[PDB]
Nucleic acid binder design. Sequence first.
RNA 1: CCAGAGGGCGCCCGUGAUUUUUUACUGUGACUAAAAAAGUGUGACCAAAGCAGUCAUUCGACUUGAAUUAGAAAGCAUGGGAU
RNA 2: CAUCCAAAAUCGAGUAACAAUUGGAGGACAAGUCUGGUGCCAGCACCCGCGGUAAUUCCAGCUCCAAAAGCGUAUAUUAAUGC
RNA 3: CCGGCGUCUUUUGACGAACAACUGCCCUAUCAGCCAGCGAUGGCCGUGUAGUGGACUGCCAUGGCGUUGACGGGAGCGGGGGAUUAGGGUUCGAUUCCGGAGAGGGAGCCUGAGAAAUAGCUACCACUUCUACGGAGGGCAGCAGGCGCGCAAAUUGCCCAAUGU
Lengths: 129, 258, 71, 175, 164, 142
Amino acid sequence: TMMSVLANALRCIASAERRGKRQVLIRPSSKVVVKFLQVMQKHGYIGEFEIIDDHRAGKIVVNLNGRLNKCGAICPRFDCTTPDFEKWVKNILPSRQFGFVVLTTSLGIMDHEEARARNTGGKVLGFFY
Amino acid sequence: TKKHLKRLYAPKDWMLSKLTGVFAPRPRAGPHKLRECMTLMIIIRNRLKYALNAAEAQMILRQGLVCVDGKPRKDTKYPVGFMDVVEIPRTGDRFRILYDVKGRFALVKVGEAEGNIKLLKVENVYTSTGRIPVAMTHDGHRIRYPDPRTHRGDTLVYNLKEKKVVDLIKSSNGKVVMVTGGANRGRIGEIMSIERHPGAFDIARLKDAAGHEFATRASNIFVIGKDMQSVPVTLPKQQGLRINVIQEREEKLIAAEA
Amino acid sequence: GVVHSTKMKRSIVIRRDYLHFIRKYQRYQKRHRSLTVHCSPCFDPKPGDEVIVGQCRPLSKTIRYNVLEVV
Amino acid sequence: GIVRSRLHKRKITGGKTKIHRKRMKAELGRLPAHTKLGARRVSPVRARGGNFKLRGLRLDTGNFAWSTEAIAQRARILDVVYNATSNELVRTKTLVKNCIVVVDAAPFKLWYAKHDELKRKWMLRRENHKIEKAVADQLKEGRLLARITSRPGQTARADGALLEGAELQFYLKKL
Amino acid sequence: MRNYNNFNRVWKAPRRPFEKERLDREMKLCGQYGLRCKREIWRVNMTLSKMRRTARLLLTLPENHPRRQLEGSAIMRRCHDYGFLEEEKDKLDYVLSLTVPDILERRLQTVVFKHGLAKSVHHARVLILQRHIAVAKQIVTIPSFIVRVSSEHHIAFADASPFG
Amino acid sequence: TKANGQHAARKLVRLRRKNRWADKGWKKSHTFVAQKANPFGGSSHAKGIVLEKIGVGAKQPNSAIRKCVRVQLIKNDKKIIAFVPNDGCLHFIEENDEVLVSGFGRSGHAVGDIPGVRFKIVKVSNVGLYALYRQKKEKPRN
RNA sequence: CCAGAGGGCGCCCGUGAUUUUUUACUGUGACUAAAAAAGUGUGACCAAAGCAGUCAUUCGACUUGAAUUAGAAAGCAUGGGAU
RNA sequence: CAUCCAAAAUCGAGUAACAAUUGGAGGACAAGUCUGGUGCCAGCACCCGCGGUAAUUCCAGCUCCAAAAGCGUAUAUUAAUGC
RNA sequence: CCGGCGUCUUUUGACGAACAACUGCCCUAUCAGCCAGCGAUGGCCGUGUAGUGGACUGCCAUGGCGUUGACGGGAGCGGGGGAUUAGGGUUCGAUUCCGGAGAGGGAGCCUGAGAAAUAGCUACCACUUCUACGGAGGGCAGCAGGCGCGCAAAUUGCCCAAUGU
């Protein structure tokens, strides 16, 4: 089976992006997968997306503008902290300039940049370039 | 039974050095605990400088020229903790030890009639034989016949001119209060609230003047007065307010340009 | 802690379970303290129930605890 | 010497402790004192507190108390009827706490008759008072059953309380 | 026993000492500035690496962090002193543009020569060690004494000097 | 591969503890059979009493004769071979003279063109043998 | 030296819950020997170092300085409520 | 250690004999198109390899190189190791 | 007439002593079962101790621990900390400070507030020194120093001036 929802979604996006395809299908939907997409659509990396309803589990559909290069998943959801933002941001990303790690917090779902700003660490979620 | 102490294992609030000597004095047991006290010899020698050597401190004290609590002492080693008045009548000076801001022993200089005042925190109350009530203090003093309103952790104003206890002061409500130990030493503020955790340490939250709240243990509360304009005793060099690291460094430079 | 067994007269067996952390692998492990307690004849909790236990003076060789309450 | 320690004993896992330390004088048993009947003999020992404790040997007298009326008088210890711990003890008439015993009973009798100015005090005390039946029968004869509620082996004084109905009825039936 | 005085190394040898690239850039210094041996070139390297480590670590941090604030001003302050950097510098990237020569340049040996009080660096190393130089009024007979930006304009000569 | 679970820890630990026994760079440290085997006891040097001078051949690609010394060890009563590592200093070693013995280079493999010998003779009678070779000191027979 | 009115906090105890409620994680705060390390000040001639000293100018001044940070788990308090 | 060679009065370098050494120069690895001696011998060589009379590696001299009042050698341990 | 010392007993702060527990700790399964006659786990009543307690006697019950590695074996005084590493880590800790233990090997004991003390005592064992041989002693892992040992490590010096007791 699949033991991470995110992993199932963002291996469709990455593959599709490397083939230059301008839409992708996503088999499941979660409250979580939504939030992840939302982020990247603000910062300009996605055109739009639709959630469709089968009344069992939804099928997300996304429009890629080709502005992504990867969307990963950090699977164990390891604990990152106020000092350790530095660590992750160096090690898994090609840059500090345009690398975006996305984290979970009690507050919501947000970029590392906004995480530091509000001074709360948390468990990591995923990342994109 | 320990009868030796090494300089490193001794407090560095006595401000000994790593080099020069190997031992430090272990004082005779008395009112105050080993960590919170400062031994006579340390004071006279390293601070006041009426002695340049150990032997010179014996010369002064054994003879007697020095009083604490207004009693003359022939003791070479004796504790001096907190709220103790020491008087050398030869100089004619009256020191009152306290906790200075930044964890330092303060030596503060007082008018002569203030040096008959003293403040002792109560630890336990209990009834002893004959139904005679007793407040036992943090300096080990026994106050016979305390007021019926006395409670644990309150202060008793204590006349050293002749021994008795005038009106008390409670730890109740917001009152001007200062900290003992815990590395918030000498910092003064109002009690904002007193938290309770039964079966465990009772947190209290203090708020010093110009805001900046903080938390310290109930055990480390020592009352001063009713209000900051009703204080019975003097404050050390700084008023009980700490400042940021940046501002320390800034001011150090500004004065060094003179 | 829970109830591991109800065996013995006025003595129960409690099992605490917690998590230790290892830095190198960045991953937790499960480790349990199997402990003995003196259960008051007031209470008699079933296996799997959760118990609360306090700190009392020694009462046997192994027993240091006592049962305050039961859930 | 004799010691009180968990470090010559098996663990809960069935394993064995291993030593690295020679035994302290802090931990320290001593041989049991044997209090019996006969002439009083008291041999002190010095203890760790800087004070003495007294080894009762052969105490034949005790300070006994009657429950409910808040009194007491001395009387003579005659016999031991019973004990929880062993039968062996009882036969040698050793005195150790929570042995049932037998006493002279004479002063209690004397007292209870005192329980013109005097005379009306009696009538007031007779009123709103009663006594168990099994008590009074024995107290008439001049023997009684009591318990020794002080440990005589470390004080060299044997004090006891006198049995009253609830508990008396139990020890009686065990005989 | 009972010694509580520290020891530390101030100099270390770079890895792979037979690099012909490194050899060039060693001799170039040690001959020019009149240095005794390579040990000196390394001594400054260490202390520079040290400084550059904390500066890197500070630079990483978000704005308005206590480490950044306090310790940033200090690093900058002490490069204003000794004249390594000027007072138009503040970034903590300027600090990372410091290299080995700018240190050596402010050693007493070179400063003496450059101020016009000797005819060579070799000659100025003698002038130091023959006890005939000063750094304001204080006789200094160490060539590795780093000279303040203020006090390189008050060098003069010793008052023990037959040349002064 | 590996396990990425949160509570996966103990499986990881036990895996490493197994697979380090397939390393010989683990065994060489932790195991005391290695220590025992080494003729010095794992000490830096040892002394021995010279027994006999033994002429030793050489391997096929480089034909030479090599001068070696059969020595006995005071410490453990083991015998060993060692090489004389200077030109024409076989003289300066004589029978029943105390002598020191060292390892040479790689100490798990024998040196080229001398099989079985990892051992070179540094000092004869605590005198530096190099010192005798390139003359400074003279050998005592005192 | 206010009858009545609802009261409003503080304190202690008693009673009531259809099923009270916790923990990891995180932010902040408590509580925690020195030596050692990171670090602030300072021309021990520099330097490893040290916690000293420095200034007028005398029959002392600086309210002289001797900052500050980190220091595994585990335990403590209190916010947050996504996973 | 420091301060000094008179304050009236007190020493002293020119081969500056007050004279720097320990390991290297085929490759790895900074430095010999050298000269004599030896000739698969003697020996060198961590490893690759040198020596059978034509030796850039041996045994000597000169020359140059690296570090320097320190420099080689042995063993263990750490980095090198994502072996 | 007053002052300064000194002491009995009682009282409780301090300086410490003695117990207990929450959490953590190298390798090994070609060490998987361990524990109860003579205490293993618990209950009940006593005994003992300064005190709690299977610490111990008597009686009664049949439990306790284990692949989340018990039990056994090997290596090792523990920690603060050292070395090395960009990071993660890797490795060391006999040794100045703190804690524990020991004084040739073992056991027993007195005195004292505190000791199972060892430049205190008693005994045995392994050594070892004197004796007109009837007896009497010795314990450096305190400082120097000597012998032995091994690759390997200082003067039978001066001083209580300093730092402490």
